[PDB]
Design a binder for this molecule. Structure first.
Ligand code: HG
Ligand code: HG
Length: 128
């Protein structure tokens, strides 16, 4: 939709998109995350985390080490452009971020930092 997208993470460790386009005219962009299924956060938690592609691995690694009580995301990580909280089934979280934090000629990735999820739960985010 305009300057916004709705995203689902399911019980099979899947997002329902692997590619997000952000319209350059947008002043900010919003992601609304939900979690179909019936499994809880500790088992099948999802978040939506944005970083440059170059920074993704560092964020994933430091997030795992941060623990479940930190939503598997390092607090105040300067590499995380925007993020939701970790959610289980039946829950919702959203994030709005300034589009000025993105540039052209930079590859962005979105992913989930729950342990082992990012191998499957990841995609591209592009400003155009
Ligand atoms: Hg996940
Ligand atoms: Hg990556």
């Amino acid at each position: 939709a305009e300057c916004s997208v709705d995203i689902q993470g399911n019980d099979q460790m899947q997002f329902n998109t692997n590619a997000i386009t952000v319209d350059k005219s947008c002043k900010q962009f919003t992601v609304n995350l939900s979690h179909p299924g019936n499994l809880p956060k500790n088992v099948m938690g999802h978040n939506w985390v944005l970083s440059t592609a170059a920074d993704m691995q560092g964020v994933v690694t430091d997030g795992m080490a941060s623990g479940l009580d930190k939503d598997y995301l390092k607090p105040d990580d300067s590499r995380v452009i925007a993020h939701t909280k970790l959610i289980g089934s039946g829950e919702k979280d959203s994030v709005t971020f300034d589009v000025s934090k993105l540039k052209e000629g930079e590859q962005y990735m979105f992913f989930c930092t729950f342990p082992g999820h990012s191998a499957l739960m990841k995609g591209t985010l592009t400003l155009k």
